[PDB]
Amino acid sequence: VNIVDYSDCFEGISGGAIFCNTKNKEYNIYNKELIETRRSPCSTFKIVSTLIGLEKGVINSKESVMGYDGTDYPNKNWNKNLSLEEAFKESCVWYYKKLINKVDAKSVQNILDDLKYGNCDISEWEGDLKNGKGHLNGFWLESSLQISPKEQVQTMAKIFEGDTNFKKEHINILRDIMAIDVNDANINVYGKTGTGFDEKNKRVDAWFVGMLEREGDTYYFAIKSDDSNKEITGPKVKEIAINIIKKYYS
Ligand SMILES: *C(=O)N1C[C@H](NOS(=O)(=O)O)CC[C@H]1C(N)=O
DSSP: OOOOHHHHHHHOEEEEEEEETTTTTTEEESSSHHHHHOOOOOOGGGGHHHHHHTTSSSOOSSSOOOOOOOOSSGGGGGGSSOOOHHHHHHHHHHHHHHHTTTOOOHHHHHHHHHOOOOOOOOSSSOOOOHHHHHHHHTTTSSSSBBBBBHHHHHHHHHHHOSSSSSSSHHHHHHHHHHOOOOTTTTSEEEEEEEEEEEEETTEEEEEEEEEEEETTTTEEEEEEEEEEEEEEEHHHHHHHHHHHHHOOOO
């Protein structure tokens, strides 16, 4: 367990990072207090909800559709019968809400418990309805479910090292749709962004969670901002993550 200083890559944004290599148990932690603090996962939950949907047969491949019904949305790419792969990369909320609402709560509770997914609290299934967004809400979006960056890395490691009961076929679908182009062919990077705003504390929940493969070694990582500047989003934290990977993990 090494405490490290990645602050230069954060360019003044408040946050932390944790990288974990489970072969030689090298835990690299920037901002330990924040890395141990549970927060809403926001759209990073799509990593797990994809696996739930595959396991329950709601979806079956990276092509699978959820029966688009024609509802109008401001994002162009939500207005179509998009595949799993496209809905994951577009972070399409209606697709993943319809997916999870096909699964019974007991099944989800038991999967989260098995994964040790933070507080495993799905009590507010419908999500943060006070924000006015209605069905564009759920327990994983600034609501009851909370997970720390350290727990995110532990969950990613358990899934992608083959230590859960999820089918290998399903884990490989997730790897495929999580793959990121970082303009460096000598590392494979996978992950998912998440963006929320914590109204109580007036801070963002901006995430990038995933894994890095670099010649034999695999690192599981979670990068998280809690800045008060509302302009700090998941995509911005992903930029910071890539700069950390290129500086310190090449
Ligand atoms: C998930 O965090 N969300 C869905 C969507 N994607 O965000 S991301 O670019 O950080 O992955 C928009 C924001 C958020 C939401 N409001 O539901």
